[PDB]
């Protein structure tokens, strides 16, 4: 009802990218009910990731969290590189290059064993990711998240034009 | 009528052929390629190829290493790779020899979808509509995943059945 439209209206009106991304994550948490919604954005040189939203994780302020965008990123780095969506059941059942290494693995927001990574793609390049999980608990979930990443992406192009 | 016919078979390759038939003949996907890992899981044998003229996949066996580019990555990571144009992806996505000697595998645009049994890939669907300019999308991926799911269920049924 009322909830999805307010979220939608406030993104279209937004003129700050970090705010659009925070609203995307709030949308997905409050309106669609996913427990944890993280958004990570690459820096211009594409060698670091900063956290912009970590909805559903408490006692965590991401400010000044930079994460190396290399092999220590595990499946998150693979997403930036290949722009695929990863649906992970139990990340230990996967190749060695999936596991988040340190510093990623000392961050409660990132410590789930099952989850979805969805790239935010502008100009043929993943410029960030949504990482979503239900720690306390499919393709229609993916598609729904992709929608929000699509909207994030269009809002980034649009805000940047302004 | 092919969910019914899969059901009736106790020959894995036949079930794979019928899956590829259904996707192609009924749903209109132009090229449907199905490859199964050998027992050591270091090669793929080419089991079904629908839509590629003048080609019988029997006897074709391909290395599961880097030469298989994104097919090997699909198999290793158990991830759907939806590749709208291969030239927009890193170099290690491209097929190398011997994979690139096969017409059935030469699309520049495709989806590769793992066939997964109990958390392990045992083969792949590689699907393309290369003569159409329309890119495959998320609903095409749902449809291909559905047939991979049927192949995987039926492989399990057949294996549980023939186990001595």
């Amino acid at each position: 009802s009322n909830a999805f439209h307010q979220i939608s209206s406030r993104i279209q009106k937004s003129i700050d990218v970090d705010e659009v991304l925070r609203l995307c994550a709030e949308g997905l948490h409050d309106v669609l009910g996913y427990e944890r919604v993280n958004i990570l954005m690459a820096d211009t040189a594409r060698t670091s990731l900063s956290f912009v939203a970590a909805v559903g994780t408490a006692d965590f302020n991401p400010a000044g969290v930079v994460l190396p965008l290399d092999q220590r990123g595990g499946v998150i780095t693979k997403c930036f590189t290949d722009r695929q969506v990863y649906m992970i059941d139990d990340v230990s059942a996967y190749p060695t290059d999936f596991r988040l290494q340190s510093p990623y693995d000392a961050i409660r927001a990132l410590r789930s064993k099952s989850f979805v990574i969805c790239p935010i793609v502008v100009k043929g390049e993943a410029i960030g990711v949504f990482a979503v999980d239900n720690r306390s608990s499919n393709d229609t979930d993916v598609d729904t998240i992709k929608l929000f990443a699509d909207q994030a992406s269009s809002a980034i192009v649009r805000i940047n034009l302004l």
Side-chain angles (χ1 to χ4, degrees), chain A:
Chain A
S1 262
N2 214 151
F4 178 81
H5 190 70
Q6 219 77 182
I7 279 62
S8 154
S9 240
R10 297 164 75 198
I11 141 259
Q12 206 208 40
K13 307 177 195 185
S14 189
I15 44 159
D16 185 78
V17 158
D18 295 352
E19 174 177 86
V20 164
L21 299 173
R22 293 182 315 259
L23 307 169
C24 284
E26 168 191 320
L28 284 163
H29 181 83
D30 313 322
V31 189
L32 294 304
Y34 307 101
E35 298 176 22
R36 306 258 191 168
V37 182
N38 305 295
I39 304 167
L40 298 67
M41 303 290 302
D43 70 329
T44 305
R46 299 179 70 69
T47 52
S48 306
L49 289 192
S50 45
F51 235 120
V52 178
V55 169
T57 297
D59 308 333
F60 184 44
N61 162 35
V65 186
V66 278
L67 293 170
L69 205 172
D70 62 20
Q71 76 287 335
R72 298 176 267 185
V75 67
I76 287 165
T77 298
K78 286 185 83 44
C79 196
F80 281 91
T81 306
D82 52 56
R83 319 181 285 280
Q84 301 307 302
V85 175
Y86 296 79
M87 323 186 35
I88 306 305
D89 60 25
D90 166 5
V91 69
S92 58
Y94 283 87
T96 55
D97 73 346
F98 280 50
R99 193 190 35 107
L100 299 190
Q101 298 177 25
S102 158
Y104 290 77
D105 72 339
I107 298 172
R108 294 175 286 111
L110 300 187
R111 278 166 61 90
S112 178
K113 261 34 197 56
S114 95
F115 57 82
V116 181
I117 315 295
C118 181
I120 289 156
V121 176
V122 165
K123 242 257 220 201
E125 227 200 6
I127 52 161
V129 299
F130 283 66
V132 166
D133 76 80
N134 296 334
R135 273 144 193 253
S136 314
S137 170
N138 72 354
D139 293 310
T140 139
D141 285 1
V142 173
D143 285 351
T144 277
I145 293 161
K146 280 211 215 195
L147 182 136
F148 284 80
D150 275 352
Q151 301 312 108
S153 166
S154 290
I156 292 172
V157 166
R158 164 173 76 72
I159 283 147
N160 286 346
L161 188 71
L162 179 39

mmCIF file of all heavy atoms in Angstrom, chain A residues 57-93:
data_model
loop_
_atom_site.group_PDB
_atom_site.id
_atom_site.type_symbol
_atom_site.label_atom_id
_atom_site.label_comp_id
_atom_site.label_asym_id
_atom_site.label_seq_id
_atom_site.Cartn_x
_atom_site.Cartn_y
_atom_site.Cartn_z
ATOM 1 N N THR A 57 21.583 -4.634 10.459
ATOM 2 C CA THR A 57 22.678 -4.896 11.346
ATOM 3 C C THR A 57 22.809 -3.765 12.354
ATOM 4 O O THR A 57 23.062 -2.632 11.977
ATOM 5 C CB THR A 57 24.068 -4.993 10.594
ATOM 6 O OG1 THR A 57 24.087 -6.094 9.682
ATOM 7 C CG2 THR A 57 25.200 -5.178 11.587
ATOM 8 N N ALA A 58 22.750 -4.101 13.648
ATOM 9 C CA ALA A 58 22.835 -3.092 14.731
ATOM 10 C C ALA A 58 24.286 -2.761 15.207
ATOM 11 O O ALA A 58 25.228 -3.514 14.953
ATOM 12 C CB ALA A 58 21.993 -3.578 15.842
ATOM 13 N N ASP A 59 24.485 -1.652 15.914
ATOM 14 C CA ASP A 59 25.825 -1.299 16.481
ATOM 15 C C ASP A 59 26.935 -1.217 15.391
ATOM 16 O O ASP A 59 28.128 -1.537 15.607
ATOM 17 C CB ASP A 59 26.259 -2.251 17.653
ATOM 18 C CG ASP A 59 25.204 -2.393 18.761
ATOM 19 O OD1 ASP A 59 24.394 -1.442 18.962
ATOM 20 O OD2 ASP A 59 25.171 -3.478 19.414
ATOM 21 N N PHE A 60 26.522 -0.791 14.197
ATOM 22 C CA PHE A 60 27.422 -0.689 13.075
ATOM 23 C C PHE A 60 27.229 0.637 12.348
ATOM 24 O O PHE A 60 26.182 0.892 11.808
ATOM 25 C CB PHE A 60 27.205 -1.893 12.139
ATOM 26 C CG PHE A 60 28.169 -1.944 10.989
ATOM 27 C CD1 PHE A 60 29.533 -1.703 11.189
ATOM 28 C CD2 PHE A 60 27.715 -2.260 9.715
ATOM 29 C CE1 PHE A 60 30.440 -1.754 10.113
ATOM 30 C CE2 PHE A 60 28.598 -2.324 8.643
ATOM 31 C CZ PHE A 60 29.961 -2.070 8.827
ATOM 32 N N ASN A 61 28.250 1.478 12.374
ATOM 33 C CA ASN A 61 28.291 2.701 11.591
ATOM 34 C C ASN A 61 29.450 2.508 10.589
ATOM 35 O O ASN A 61 30.616 2.414 11.010
ATOM 36 C CB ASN A 61 28.453 3.921 12.526
ATOM 37 C CG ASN A 61 28.948 5.184 11.812
ATOM 38 O OD1 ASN A 61 28.616 5.445 10.648
ATOM 39 N ND2 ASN A 61 29.743 5.989 12.534
ATOM 40 N N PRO A 62 29.105 2.358 9.288
ATOM 41 C CA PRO A 62 30.059 2.047 8.186
ATOM 42 C C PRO A 62 31.145 3.133 7.879
ATOM 43 O O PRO A 62 32.226 2.820 7.323
ATOM 44 C CB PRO A 62 29.169 1.823 6.976
ATOM 45 C CG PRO A 62 27.733 1.973 7.424
ATOM 46 C CD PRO A 62 27.698 2.120 8.915
ATOM 47 N N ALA A 63 30.872 4.385 8.250
ATOM 48 C CA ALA A 63 31.800 5.498 8.015
ATOM 49 C C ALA A 63 33.277 5.105 8.176
ATOM 50 O O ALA A 63 33.688 4.566 9.230
ATOM 51 C CB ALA A 63 31.462 6.653 8.961
ATOM 52 N N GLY A 64 34.083 5.356 7.140
ATOM 53 C CA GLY A 64 35.523 5.081 7.240
ATOM 54 C C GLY A 64 35.884 3.605 7.048
ATOM 55 O O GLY A 64 37.090 3.251 7.028
ATOM 56 N N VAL A 65 34.856 2.745 6.921
ATOM 57 C CA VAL A 65 35.066 1.371 6.414
ATOM 58 C C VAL A 65 35.331 1.394 4.913
ATOM 59 O O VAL A 65 34.416 1.592 4.096
ATOM 60 C CB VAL A 65 33.913 0.388 6.737
ATOM 61 C CG1 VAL A 65 34.301 -1.018 6.290
ATOM 62 C CG2 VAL A 65 33.562 0.412 8.276
ATOM 63 N N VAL A 66 36.609 1.252 4.577
ATOM 64 C CA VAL A 66 37.026 0.898 3.234
ATOM 65 C C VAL A 66 37.442 -0.568 3.224
ATOM 66 O O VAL A 66 37.977 -1.077 4.215
ATOM 67 C CB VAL A 66 38.112 1.811 2.649
ATOM 68 C CG1 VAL A 66 37.447 3.101 2.078
ATOM 69 C CG2 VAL A 66 39.173 2.149 3.706
ATOM 70 N N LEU A 67 37.119 -1.246 2.125
ATOM 71 C CA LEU A 67 37.364 -2.664 1.983
ATOM 72 C C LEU A 67 38.176 -2.831 0.720
ATOM 73 O O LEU A 67 37.865 -2.213 -0.297
ATOM 74 C CB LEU A 67 36.055 -3.415 1.877
ATOM 75 C CG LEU A 67 35.286 -3.341 3.165
ATOM 76 C CD1 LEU A 67 33.916 -3.862 2.990
ATOM 77 C CD2 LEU A 67 36.003 -4.130 4.235
ATOM 78 N N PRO A 68 39.262 -3.614 0.785
ATOM 79 C CA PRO A 68 40.052 -3.706 -0.443
ATOM 80 C C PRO A 68 39.201 -4.423 -1.511
ATOM 81 O O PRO A 68 38.497 -5.395 -1.184
ATOM 82 C CB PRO A 68 41.256 -4.537 -0.009
ATOM 83 C CG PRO A 68 40.687 -5.454 1.019
ATOM 84 C CD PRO A 68 39.650 -4.643 1.774
ATOM 85 N N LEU A 69 39.179 -3.888 -2.739
ATOM 86 C CA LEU A 69 38.453 -4.570 -3.817
ATOM 87 C C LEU A 69 39.403 -5.488 -4.530
ATOM 88 O O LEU A 69 39.795 -5.233 -5.688
ATOM 89 C CB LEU A 69 37.802 -3.595 -4.833
ATOM 90 C CG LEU A 69 36.583 -4.159 -5.597
ATOM 91 C CD1 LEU A 69 35.889 -3.026 -6.431
ATOM 92 C CD2 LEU A 69 36.874 -5.367 -6.484
ATOM 93 N N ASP A 70 39.757 -6.584 -3.856
ATOM 94 C CA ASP A 70 40.584 -7.625 -4.463
ATOM 95 C C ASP A 70 40.079 -8.993 -4.045
ATOM 96 O O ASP A 70 38.929 -9.166 -3.740
ATOM 97 C CB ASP A 70 42.088 -7.399 -4.195
ATOM 98 C CG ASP A 70 42.464 -7.435 -2.663
ATOM 99 O OD1 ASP A 70 41.711 -7.978 -1.845
ATOM 100 O OD2 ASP A 70 43.535 -6.928 -2.270
ATOM 101 N N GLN A 71 40.960 -9.985 -4.064
ATOM 102 C CA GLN A 71 40.567 -11.372 -3.826
ATOM 103 C C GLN A 71 40.052 -11.626 -2.409
ATOM 104 O O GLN A 71 39.316 -12.605 -2.144
ATOM 105 C CB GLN A 71 41.741 -12.320 -4.240
ATOM 106 C CG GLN A 71 42.894 -12.367 -3.244
ATOM 107 C CD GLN A 71 43.777 -11.091 -3.225
ATOM 108 O OE1 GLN A 71 43.864 -10.344 -4.215
ATOM 109 N NE2 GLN A 71 44.438 -10.853 -2.093
ATOM 110 N N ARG A 72 40.356 -10.708 -1.496
ATOM 111 C CA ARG A 72 39.836 -10.799 -0.117
ATOM 112 C C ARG A 72 38.376 -10.537 -0.086
ATOM 113 O O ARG A 72 37.678 -10.953 0.856
ATOM 114 C CB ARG A 72 40.565 -9.767 0.765
ATOM 115 C CG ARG A 72 42.081 -10.046 0.835
ATOM 116 C CD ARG A 72 42.780 -8.983 1.612
ATOM 117 N NE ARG A 72 43.254 -7.951 0.712
ATOM 118 C CZ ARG A 72 44.000 -6.909 1.073
ATOM 119 N NH1 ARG A 72 44.336 -6.743 2.356
ATOM 120 N NH2 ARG A 72 44.410 -6.038 0.150
ATOM 121 N N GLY A 73 37.882 -9.836 -1.130
ATOM 122 C CA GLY A 73 36.439 -9.733 -1.361
ATOM 123 C C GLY A 73 35.650 -10.974 -1.767
ATOM 124 O O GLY A 73 34.379 -10.953 -1.776
ATOM 125 N N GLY A 74 36.335 -12.059 -2.115
ATOM 126 C CA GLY A 74 35.621 -13.301 -2.371
ATOM 127 C C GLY A 74 34.499 -13.172 -3.388
ATOM 128 O O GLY A 74 34.731 -12.671 -4.434
ATOM 129 N N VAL A 75 33.295 -13.638 -3.085
ATOM 130 C CA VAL A 75 32.198 -13.586 -4.070
ATOM 131 C C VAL A 75 31.767 -12.124 -4.446
ATOM 132 O O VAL A 75 31.408 -11.846 -5.605
ATOM 133 C CB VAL A 75 31.037 -14.470 -3.646
ATOM 134 C CG1 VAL A 75 30.396 -13.910 -2.426
ATOM 135 C CG2 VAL A 75 29.996 -14.701 -4.798
ATOM 136 N N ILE A 76 31.917 -11.187 -3.499
ATOM 137 C CA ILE A 76 31.616 -9.774 -3.753
ATOM 138 C C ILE A 76 32.532 -9.229 -4.842
ATOM 139 O O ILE A 76 32.079 -8.537 -5.767
ATOM 140 C CB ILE A 76 31.704 -8.942 -2.442
ATOM 141 C CG1 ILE A 76 30.497 -9.268 -1.578
ATOM 142 C CG2 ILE A 76 31.879 -7.437 -2.753
ATOM 143 C CD1 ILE A 76 30.668 -8.808 -0.150
ATOM 144 N N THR A 77 33.821 -9.507 -4.751
ATOM 145 C CA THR A 77 34.725 -9.087 -5.826
ATOM 146 C C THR A 77 34.393 -9.719 -7.216
ATOM 147 O O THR A 77 34.534 -9.045 -8.273
ATOM 148 C CB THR A 77 36.186 -9.359 -5.440
ATOM 149 O OG1 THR A 77 36.468 -8.580 -4.283
ATOM 150 C CG2 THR A 77 37.201 -8.934 -6.554
ATOM 151 N N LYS A 78 34.006 -10.996 -7.200
ATOM 152 C CA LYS A 78 33.648 -11.736 -8.410
ATOM 153 C C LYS A 78 32.494 -10.990 -9.081
ATOM 154 O O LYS A 78 32.549 -10.775 -10.281
ATOM 155 C CB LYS A 78 33.249 -13.203 -8.064
ATOM 156 C CG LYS A 78 34.493 -14.115 -7.678
ATOM 157 C CD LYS A 78 34.142 -15.641 -7.446
ATOM 158 C CE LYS A 78 34.080 -16.462 -8.750
ATOM 159 N NZ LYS A 78 35.194 -16.210 -9.749
ATOM 160 N N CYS A 79 31.507 -10.541 -8.296
ATOM 161 C CA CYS A 79 30.365 -9.733 -8.795
ATOM 162 C C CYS A 79 30.775 -8.447 -9.505
ATOM 163 O O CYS A 79 30.287 -8.180 -10.610
ATOM 164 C CB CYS A 79 29.429 -9.391 -7.667
ATOM 165 S SG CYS A 79 27.762 -8.793 -8.162
ATOM 166 N N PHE A 80 31.676 -7.664 -8.889
ATOM 167 C CA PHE A 80 32.196 -6.464 -9.522
ATOM 168 C C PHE A 80 32.874 -6.754 -10.826
ATOM 169 O O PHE A 80 32.792 -5.938 -11.735
ATOM 170 C CB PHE A 80 33.209 -5.706 -8.672
ATOM 171 C CG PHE A 80 32.566 -4.890 -7.620
ATOM 172 C CD1 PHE A 80 32.340 -5.435 -6.340
ATOM 173 C CD2 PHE A 80 32.156 -3.600 -7.903
ATOM 174 C CE1 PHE A 80 31.679 -4.674 -5.339
ATOM 175 C CE2 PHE A 80 31.505 -2.827 -6.928
ATOM 176 C CZ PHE A 80 31.259 -3.372 -5.639
ATOM 177 N N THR A 81 33.578 -7.880 -10.888
ATOM 178 C CA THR A 81 34.326 -8.242 -12.054
ATOM 179 C C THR A 81 33.398 -8.758 -13.158
ATOM 180 O O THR A 81 33.599 -8.383 -14.299
ATOM 181 C CB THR A 81 35.449 -9.245 -11.721
ATOM 182 O OG1 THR A 81 36.239 -8.683 -10.658
ATOM 183 C CG2 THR A 81 36.361 -9.468 -12.946
ATOM 184 N N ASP A 82 32.383 -9.557 -12.823
ATOM 185 C CA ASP A 82 31.663 -10.271 -13.883
ATOM 186 C C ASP A 82 30.242 -9.869 -14.103
ATOM 187 O O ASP A 82 29.608 -10.378 -15.025
ATOM 188 C CB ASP A 82 31.811 -11.811 -13.903
ATOM 189 C CG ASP A 82 31.527 -12.502 -12.607
ATOM 190 O OD1 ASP A 82 30.435 -12.380 -11.962
ATOM 191 O OD2 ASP A 82 32.437 -13.297 -12.269
ATOM 192 N N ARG A 83 29.760 -8.989 -13.223
ATOM 193 C CA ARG A 83 28.373 -8.489 -13.258
ATOM 194 C C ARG A 83 27.309 -9.576 -13.283
ATOM 195 O O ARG A 83 26.246 -9.409 -13.864
ATOM 196 C CB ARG A 83 28.149 -7.470 -14.397
ATOM 197 C CG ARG A 83 29.270 -6.519 -14.549
ATOM 198 C CD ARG A 83 28.984 -5.510 -15.677
ATOM 199 N NE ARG A 83 29.130 -6.042 -17.039
ATOM 200 C CZ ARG A 83 30.298 -6.190 -17.663
ATOM 201 N NH1 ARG A 83 31.448 -5.901 -17.038
ATOM 202 N NH2 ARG A 83 30.322 -6.634 -18.920
ATOM 203 N N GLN A 84 27.544 -10.673 -12.595
ATOM 204 C CA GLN A 84 26.515 -11.666 -12.459
ATOM 205 C C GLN A 84 25.849 -11.506 -11.104
ATOM 206 O O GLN A 84 26.450 -10.958 -10.175
ATOM 207 C CB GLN A 84 27.137 -13.098 -12.609
ATOM 208 C CG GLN A 84 27.839 -13.395 -13.922
ATOM 209 C CD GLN A 84 26.967 -13.116 -15.141
ATOM 210 O OE1 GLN A 84 25.893 -13.674 -15.289
ATOM 211 N NE2 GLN A 84 27.400 -12.202 -15.963
ATOM 212 N N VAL A 85 24.649 -12.036 -10.974
ATOM 213 C CA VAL A 85 23.992 -12.185 -9.719
ATOM 214 C C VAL A 85 24.420 -13.530 -9.073
ATOM 215 O O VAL A 85 24.320 -14.567 -9.736
ATOM 216 C CB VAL A 85 22.439 -12.242 -9.974
ATOM 217 C CG1 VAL A 85 21.696 -12.533 -8.686
ATOM 218 C CG2 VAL A 85 21.949 -10.903 -10.607
ATOM 219 N N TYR A 86 24.911 -13.527 -7.823
ATOM 220 C CA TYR A 86 25.226 -14.765 -7.094
ATOM 221 C C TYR A 86 24.190 -15.081 -6.042
ATOM 222 O O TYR A 86 23.898 -14.266 -5.183
ATOM 223 C CB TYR A 86 26.626 -14.719 -6.469
ATOM 224 C CG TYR A 86 27.728 -14.640 -7.510
ATOM 225 C CD1 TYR A 86 28.044 -13.459 -8.126
ATOM 226 C CD2 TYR A 86 28.440 -15.775 -7.880
ATOM 227 C CE1 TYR A 86 29.067 -13.376 -9.083
ATOM 228 C CE2 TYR A 86 29.458 -15.707 -8.888
ATOM 229 C CZ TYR A 86 29.739 -14.538 -9.471
ATOM 230 O OH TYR A 86 30.743 -14.508 -10.444
ATOM 231 N N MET A 87 23.590 -16.258 -6.145
ATOM 232 C CA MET A 87 22.708 -16.762 -5.091
ATOM 233 C C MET A 87 23.466 -17.867 -4.316
ATOM 234 O O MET A 87 23.816 -18.904 -4.869
ATOM 235 C CB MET A 87 21.416 -17.296 -5.685
ATOM 236 C CG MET A 87 20.854 -16.513 -6.900
ATOM 237 S SD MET A 87 19.078 -17.248 -7.374
ATOM 238 C CE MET A 87 18.497 -17.661 -5.495
ATOM 239 N N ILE A 88 23.823 -17.609 -3.068
ATOM 240 C CA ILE A 88 24.710 -18.527 -2.329
ATOM 241 C C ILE A 88 23.898 -19.194 -1.201
ATOM 242 O O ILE A 88 23.249 -18.500 -0.429
ATOM 243 C CB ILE A 88 25.995 -17.785 -1.811
ATOM 244 C CG1 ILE A 88 26.742 -17.064 -2.957
ATOM 245 C CG2 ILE A 88 26.927 -18.748 -1.062
ATOM 246 C CD1 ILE A 88 27.110 -17.964 -4.134
ATOM 247 N N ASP A 89 23.869 -20.537 -1.171
ATOM 248 C CA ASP A 89 23.173 -21.323 -0.114
ATOM 249 C C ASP A 89 24.021 -21.395 1.172
ATOM 250 O O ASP A 89 23.571 -21.003 2.272
ATOM 251 C CB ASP A 89 22.827 -22.761 -0.600
ATOM 252 C CG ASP A 89 24.092 -23.580 -0.997
ATOM 253 O OD1 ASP A 89 25.210 -23.291 -0.487
ATOM 254 O OD2 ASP A 89 23.992 -24.525 -1.815
ATOM 255 N N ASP A 90 25.250 -21.888 1.028
ATOM 256 C CA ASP A 90 26.216 -22.056 2.112
ATOM 257 C C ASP A 90 27.545 -21.830 1.402
ATOM 258 O O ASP A 90 28.016 -22.686 0.618
ATOM 259 C CB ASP A 90 26.083 -23.479 2.721
ATOM 260 C CG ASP A 90 27.277 -23.898 3.641
ATOM 261 O OD1 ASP A 90 28.193 -23.086 3.915
ATOM 262 O OD2 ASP A 90 27.296 -25.095 4.084
ATOM 263 N N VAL A 91 28.129 -20.662 1.628
ATOM 264 C CA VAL A 91 29.372 -20.273 0.948
ATOM 265 C C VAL A 91 30.601 -21.220 1.147
ATOM 266 O O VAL A 91 31.585 -21.171 0.382
ATOM 267 C CB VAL A 91 29.712 -18.790 1.239
ATOM 268 C CG1 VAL A 91 30.116 -18.600 2.708
ATOM 269 C CG2 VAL A 91 30.771 -18.263 0.251
ATOM 270 N N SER A 92 30.545 -22.079 2.156
ATOM 271 C CA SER A 92 31.614 -23.078 2.347
ATOM 272 C C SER A 92 31.482 -24.234 1.358
ATOM 273 O O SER A 92 32.466 -24.982 1.165
ATOM 274 C CB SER A 92 31.667 -23.612 3.792
ATOM 275 O OG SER A 92 30.417 -24.193 4.144
ATOM 276 N N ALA A 93 30.309 -24.363 0.706
ATOM 277 C CA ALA A 93 30.107 -25.440 -0.281
ATOM 278 C C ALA A 93 30.626 -25.012 -1.653
ATOM 279 O O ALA A 93 30.460 -25.749 -2.653
ATOM 280 C CB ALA A 93 28.590 -25.907 -0.337
#
